[PDB]
Amino acid sequence: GDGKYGARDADTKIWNGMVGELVYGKADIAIAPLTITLVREEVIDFSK
Amino acid sequence: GDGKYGARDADTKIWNGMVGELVYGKADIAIAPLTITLVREEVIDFSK
Ligand SMILES: N[C@@H](Cn1cc([N+](=O)[O-])c(=O)[nH]c1=O)C(=O)O
């Protein structure tokens, strides 16, 4: 929707982007050039 | 114990090396230049 990868807002604590459409249930699997980071490995699972 | 990395025998179905000393309960964690492969992930978990 918002055309973004994914990072957490510092204020609203709201995850946006691809990651956001996962943790909020709006999608099941994410296939895109998403970068494996720490804060992301905490909220979602990553393949190799 | 055998100085090997970790591969499975095709005849006897045994795991040698560090993968083996993990799957057979000899060690708790394998910190070494151990290549992440499809067959190795199938018996022991790998970190990123
Ligand atoms: N690390 C690899 C084993 N391994 C090691 C070396 N090495 O010693 O640099 C190599 O050249 N090639 C190889 O397959 C593995 O874990 O399978």
Swiss-Prot record, chains A, B:
The record marks R8 as: Interaction with the cone snail toxin Con-ikot-ikot. Induction: Down-regulated in the pyramidal cell layer of CA1 in the hippocampus by global ischemia. Detected in forebrain. Detected in dendrites of neuronal cells. Expressed in the pyramidal cell layers of CA1 and CA3 and in the granule cell layer of the dentate gyrus. It is found in: Cell membrane; Postsynaptic cell membrane; Postsynaptic density membrane. It comes from the Eukaryota. Palmitoylated. Depalmitoylated upon L-glutamate stimulation. L-glutamate binds at P33, T35, R40. The M4 transmembrane segment mediates tetramerization and is required for cell surface expression. Belongs to the glutamate-gated ion channel (TC 1.A.10.1) family. GRIA2 subfamily. Homotetramer or heterotetramer of pore-forming glutamate receptor subunits. Tetramers may be formed by the dimerization of dimers. May interact with MPP4. Forms a ternary complex with GRIP1 and CSPG4. Interacts with ATAD1 in an ATP-dependent manner. ATAD1-catalyzed ATP hydrolysis disrupts binding to ATAD1 and to GRIP1 and leads to AMPAR complex disassembly. Interacts with GRIP2. Interacts with GRIP1. Interacts with NSF via its C-terminus. Interacts with CACNG2, PICK1 and GRIP2. Interacts with GRIA1 and SYNDIG1. Part of a complex containing GRIA2, NSF and NAPA and/or NAPB. The postsynaptic actions of L-glutamate are mediated by a variety of receptors that are named according to their selective agonists. This receptor binds AMPA (quisqualate) > L-glutamate > kainate. Ionotropic glutamate receptor that functions as a ligand-gated cation channel, gated by L-glutamate and glutamatergic agonists such as alpha-amino-3-hydroxy-5-methyl-4-isoxazolepropionic acid (AMPA), quisqualic acid, and kainic acid. L-glutamate acts as an excitatory neurotransmitter at many synapses in the central nervous system and plays an important role in fast excitatory synaptic transmission. This is Glutamate receptor 2. It comes from Rattus norvegicus. The gene is Gria2.
